[PDB]
Chains A and B, each alone.
Chain A
Amino acid sequence: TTLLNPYFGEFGGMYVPQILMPALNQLEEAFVSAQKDPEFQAQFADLLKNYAGRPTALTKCQNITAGTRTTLYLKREDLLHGGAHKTNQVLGQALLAKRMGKSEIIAETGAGQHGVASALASALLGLKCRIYMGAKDVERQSPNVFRMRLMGAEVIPVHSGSATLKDACNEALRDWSGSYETAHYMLGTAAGPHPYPTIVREFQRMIGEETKAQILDKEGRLPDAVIACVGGGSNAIGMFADFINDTSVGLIGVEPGGHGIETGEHGAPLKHGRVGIYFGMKAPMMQTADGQIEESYSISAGLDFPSVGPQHAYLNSIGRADYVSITDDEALEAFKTLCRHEGIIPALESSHALAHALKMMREQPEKEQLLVVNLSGRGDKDIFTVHDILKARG
């Protein structure tokens, strides 16, 4: 028994060991309580505005849409403290942790940016924070490891299994099962067991709520479509949420295509996976024919999640949102195009969203359309990977 529906249509649930169910029922009730508490909302808004920098800007692209009838706006979550949208929900989760009397934070991460997000939130709110990460992710993201440890976080490498994010997701839950009375599990995306998909959406929905008010102020109308990249689905559902009942607004989520879908080396389980049960949820997943869960490949480190949030799978099955894929080369071209034409270095994650927007604009250049792309992060972390690839090609 729960207060909220753990399922979005046929997707979702709480597929955790029985020992973790009290930790989830506790987290749900604290969340429902915090949602009705004006003091919790006032403190959440206070950290978002005076510490993270909300509201973020909505930049109209001057030069990128020349020659076409497309008006492109960029929701600048890249201007948030930390450099990505992940700061919004970790501030809410850490405030929830204080509401439950928790003094420790457990977090998993792959690319290291959620770990950096969790470390900065725990440091601000006075929480001891230990972070699990794949040992192979520890070696490729040593800059982000130093960031977390500079901010007082304990980085524990996970050599289990594949030594990647899905093993960090495992090792964190193992810790939380015996420490949930003092520690809180700060999940990274809009996936995992209930109430995490619901919680991360509500702590990220200011993205779309601001975008709506800003586009009404600037263009006097709602957008034709909002486009966002999808790793687990936090920045996409944060943009989509306030537009779902606006049925004239298109909801496009972009999944990593890697080297191409037909090559198998991608990360698009929502459209090219198979529905399974893992990480406490029923959702589309990257998995073998026998049911072993694979890893998502992408040039984007932040899109390495082998599954997808259940509300996205639900939104897709009913046709409310559409989900496409963008290859590594398409996102790279979008990366270079935004730099030369707007002076904004985007994250390789958000470049997938922009890449599809450029596709919509380029394939039908005389189509009059108002598009908003959620720029979920800056790309200064990616200039080294972009350099080595453009140094290798030629």
Chain B
Amino acid sequence: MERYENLFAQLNDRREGAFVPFVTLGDPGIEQSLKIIDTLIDAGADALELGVPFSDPLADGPTIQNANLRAFAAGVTPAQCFEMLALIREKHPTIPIGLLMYANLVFNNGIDAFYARCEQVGVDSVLVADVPVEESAPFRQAALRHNIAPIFICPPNADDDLLRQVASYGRGYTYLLSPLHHLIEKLKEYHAAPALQGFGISSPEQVSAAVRAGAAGAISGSAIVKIIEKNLASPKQMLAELRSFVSAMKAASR
């Protein structure tokens, strides 16, 4: 139902920016991760970017590398990741749910079948971390055939041909890593999807600066998982510090 168009329209009507936290599904456990995601949404998360544990995340840093190990240690498989995704959709109908995938888990049971199950569980978007826009043809076609938004990363070394491709083939939102001000202008010029800055977004000052720079919001990756990684022995004190951090970062976008 394009929850991104309706979230961005809302956040624009209140002159707000989006705060999108990232976590790995099933980290450190299935039940714990479900309560972690529930804590992020109540704290004030506008959207969700979720990762499926992959054995070889060659595009993620060590903090998320350990999140996959923490999830594999709990035994989380792509099968129960999607039953998690289904339960999360049935709890929060309006929030946009994004997936950070790797190409093998999508290709494994057929590309079109992977996006078919995302649509069955209510997933709004999918970014495949290791498929560049030059190799994106079969993935975005399967994603559009099941009303999924293909999310594309626009890196800091992007030339004009890349910005034109990300604007044309990208839906939902554009993943900015990042003066980003010149990159934000060109994406608005080429009518790209609203850009979310996701790169070391750690403090509330970076959420604020991203919005002022022209981006539609900020994506916090390692910052949330670091909080989970720190309080692995204290379950509630983890959620406690999770609620304080996300509501602080969400206020930074208002």
Contact = CB atoms under 8 A, between A and B. Distances in A.
Contacts of B159: 22
Interface string A1-37: 1000000000001111111011000000000000000
A383 B157 CA distance: 49
Contacts of A276: 104, 107-108
Contacts of A161: 55-56, 65, 69
A66 B168 CA distance: 68
A49 to B, nearest CB: 37
A287 B104 CA distance: 10
A187 B39 CA distance: 43
A271 B156 CA distance: 41
B154 A18 contact: yes
Contact of B132 (A18, A162, A292): A18
Given A22-B157, A161-B69, A293-B104, A17 B130 contact: yes
Given A160-B62, A291-B78, A293-B55, A21 B104 contact: no
A19 B157 contact: yes
B131 A170 contact: no
Interface in A159-204: 160-162, 166-167, 169-170, 173-174
Interface residues of A, number: 31
Given A174-B58, A277-B107, A292-B55, A19 B177 contact: yes
B107 A21 contact: no
A53 interface: no
Range, interface on chain B: 35 or more
B132 A21 contact: yes
Contacts of B78: 290-291
Given A277-B130, A278-B104, A17 B65 contact: no
A118 to B, nearest CB: 19
B129 interface: yes
A18 B133 contact: yes
B155 A19 contact: yes
A164 B134 CA distance: 30
A17 B61 CA distance: 13
B121 interface: no
26 contacts: A1-B134, A14-B132, A15-B130, A15-B135, A17-B58, A17-B129, A17-B132, A17-B153, A19-B157, A21-B132, A161-B56, A162-B55, A166-B56, A167-B56, A174-B61, A276-B107, A277-B103, A277-B131, A278-B102, A278-B103, A291-B78, A291-B104, A291-B108, A291-B109, A292-B56, A293-B55
B134 A15 contact: no
A277 B128 CA distance: 11
A290 B78 CA distance: 7
Interface in B56-106: 56-59, 61-62, 65, 69, 77-79, 102-105
B65 A160 contact: yes
A290 B75 CA distance: 12
A250 interface: no
> Can you list the 9 inter-chain pairs with the closest CB atoms, starting with the nearest?
A291-B108, A292-B55, A277-B103, A170-B58, A19-B155, A17-B59, A276-B104, A291-B105, A18-B132
B108 A15 contact: no
Interface of B: 54-59, 61-62, 65, 69, 77-79, 102-105, 107-109, 129-135, 152-159, 161-162, 177
Contact of A15 (B61, B131, B153, B157): B131
Contacts of B57: 170
Given A18-B153, A21-B134, A290 B79 contact: yes
A280 interface: yes
Contacts of B79: 290
Contacts of A282: 107
Chain B CB within 10 A, most for which of A21, A277, A282: A277
B153 A19 contact: yes
Given A17-B153, A19-B157, A290 B108 contact: yes
A162 B54 CA distance: 12
Nearest to B114: A291
Contacts of B108: 276, 287, 290-291
A293 B56 contact: yes
